[PDB]
């Protein structure tokens, strides 16, 4: 009850960098998805004012995938600017340590918003430093009372290890490895290209939600 | 000759978040400083168009302190958007691994710009994961032909270790933490509040440059 409800357990990764395209696609799928993740490529290209535009046009929740990774004072300012622009939640790296995460939690508490802790990634290169730190980063989050987590699904069983550390109550989102395996552990899956590059995004979203069931 | 020349070895960390203040202060010090570092608090608050404004008003070099820390494809897009906006260089985390760094190097090569690898940080919390990875991150940079590095100066002797790994030819910038011994290892020092919160920023900059001797 204390974590967000994501409609149909499906989050749109809106990774297009053009405002017209981003708004067009998002409008086509709003019947199916109430939660949209946007990142720096779009906001740097079009301005942070685009966040309020998504919310005012569509009434969707916005998660700012900004992978915040600075010192505490700077993290605080990034979070404040992002929440002031209307973001409901922000994604934060754990690798820079507990004080950097707490800075974000502080601003979220002040402003009534949410922090997601990114515990692990699974692109090539993640094996160098990230994967060996993942379990400790997750435990750091739990020890700090973090309730929302982002984890990779390339290895669904790792998603299980994460779920093991954070408990069943925490909110966990992940890209949608096989969605069937992923949804055993994640509360919602994140879907990008298969929807936003589709000839018919509405139909794509509708089909994804059916399979989720 | 193949790395940048920073006028007076002094980089302004322009961490103010409103455009009027940022432009006022930068204008006061441009006689002394030709290189300005801008981060997310300012650009998210005022728009990426502010980068071109600094360059057109002041003819300064801009380093975008964006601590890029995503997967390769997203890193590529962040770098492209940032360079398109006019940034001369971008600061990139090494913790996400070699492919994520190479994505940035690829765009920089294409566009004729520069990547700075952030090897280490020294805020509280950096001891958890960052400090133990620092030497390996620096070696990863060297192995990838990275020429520009950012390192912390809270422990000047750590700057010596970094300088040891990257060689004498690489370009190294660091905050200025006694400037005296930081400059034994770093090619330029980064100064923020001492200048931008000063009643007389011009005098503050002038004094700093004199101290650098």
Q: Domain coordinates of chain A in residue numbers?
A: 1-213
Between CA B97 and CA B70, with CA A143 as vertex, the angle to 5 degrees is: 20
* Separation between Cα atoms, residue B76 and residue A79, nearest integer Å: 23
In a 13 Å sphere around the CA of B78, the CA atoms on its Cβ side amount to 30
Whole-angstrom CA distances from B140 to A89, A95, A203, B103 are: 33, 17, 45, 14
Which residues between 152 and 211 in chain B have a beta carbon less than 8 angstroms from any beta carbon of chain A?
Answer: none
Q: Do A96 and B17 touch (CB under 8 A)?
A: no
The three-state secondary structure class of A207 is helix
| Lookup result for tokens 């700075």 | B116
Q: Do residues A12 and A191 lie in contact, with contact meaning Cβ atoms separated by under 8 Å?
A: yes
In a 13 Å sphere around the CA of A88, the CA atoms on its Cβ side amount to 17
* Separation between Cα atoms, residue B61 and residue A95, nearest integer Å: 30
Whole-angstrom CA distances from A89 to A80, A94, B68, B93, B180 are: 11, 16, 19, 23, 42
Class of domain A1-213: alpha beta
**E strand segments, A30-169:** 35-39, 61-68, 89-93, 114-118, 148-150
Q: Do residues A107 and A79 lie in contact, with contact meaning Cβ atoms separated by under 8 Å?
A: yes
Q: Do B96 and A45 touch (CB under 8 A)?
A: no
B183-208 burial by CB neighbour count: b if 16+ within 10 A, else e?
bebbbbbbbbeebbebeebbebbbeb
B130: nearest CB among A44, A96, A123: A96
Question: Searching chain A, which residue's CA lies closest to the CA of residue B74?
Answer: A41
* Separation between Cα atoms, residue B203 and residue B192, nearest integer Å: 14
**Residue A125: Cβ-neighbour burial (10 angstroms; 0-12, 13-18, 19+):** buried
Which value, in Å, is the radius of gyration of the alpha carbons in chain B?
Answer: 16
A47 touches chain B (CB under 8 A): yes
Between CA B175 and CA B181, with CA B176 as vertex, the angle to 5 degrees is: 110
Experimental method: X-ray
**E strand segments, chain B:** 10-14, 35-39, 61-68, 89-93, 114-118, 148-150, 171-175, 188-191
Q: Do residues A67 and A91 lie in contact, with contact meaning Cβ atoms separated by under 8 Å?
A: yes
* Separation between Cα atoms, residue A181 and residue A118, nearest integer Å: 20
* Separation between Cα atoms, residue A185 and residue A165, nearest integer Å: 12
| Lookup result for tokens 């007076």 | B8
| Lookup result for tokens 């009850």 | A1
Active site residue ranges of A = 67
Q: Do B129 and A96 touch (CB under 8 A)?
A: yes
* Separation between Cα atoms, residue B213 and residue B128, nearest integer Å: 37
A96 touches chain B (CB under 8 A): yes
B93 touches chain A (CB under 8 A): yes
Nearest in space to A106 (alpha carbons), one of A148, A153, A64, A144: A144
**Residue A180: Cβ-neighbour burial (10 angstroms; 0-12, 13-18, 19+):** exposed
Beta partners for residue A10, in sequence order: A189
Q: Do residues A117 and A141 lie in contact, with contact meaning Cβ atoms separated by under 8 Å?
A: yes
The three-state secondary structure class of B171 is strand
Backbone angles phi, psi at B182, to 5 degrees: -60, -45
Q: Do residues A176 and A190 lie in contact, with contact meaning Cβ atoms separated by under 8 Å?
A: yes
* Separation between Cα atoms, residue B183 and residue B164, nearest integer Å: 14
Between the CA atoms of A140, A144, A149 and A151, what dihedral angle is there, to the nearest 10 degrees? 0
Helix crossing, B98-111 with B130-143: angle to 10°? 50
């Amino acid at each position: 009850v204390d974590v967000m409800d994501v409609m149909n357990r499906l989050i749109l990764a809106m990774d297009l960098m053009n405002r017209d395209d981003a708004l067009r696609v998002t409008g086509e799928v709003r019947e199916y998805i109430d939660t949209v993740k946007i990142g720096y490529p779009l906001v740097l290209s079009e301005g942070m004012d685009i966040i309020a535009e998504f919310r005012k046009r569509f009434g969707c929740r916005i998660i700012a995938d900004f992978k915040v990774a600075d010192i505490p004072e700077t993290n605080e300012k990034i979070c404040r600017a992002t929440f002031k622009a209307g973001a409901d939640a922000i994604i934060v790296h754990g690798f820079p340590g507990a004080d950097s995460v707490r800075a974000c939690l502080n601003v979220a508490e002040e402003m009534g918003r949410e922090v997601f802790l990114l515990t692990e990634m699974s692109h090539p290169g993640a094996e160098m430093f990230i994967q060996g730190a993942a379990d400790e980063i997750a435990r750091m989050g739990v020890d700090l009372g973090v309730k929302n987590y982002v984890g990779p699904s390339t290895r669904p069983e790792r998603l299980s290890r994460l779920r093991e550390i954070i408990g069943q109550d925490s909110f966990l989102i992940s890209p949608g490895g096989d969605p069937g395996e992923t949804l055993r552990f994640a509360d919602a899956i994140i879907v990008g290209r298969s929807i936003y590059l589709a000839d018919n995004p509405a139909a794509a979203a509708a089909g994804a939600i059916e399979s989720i069931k």
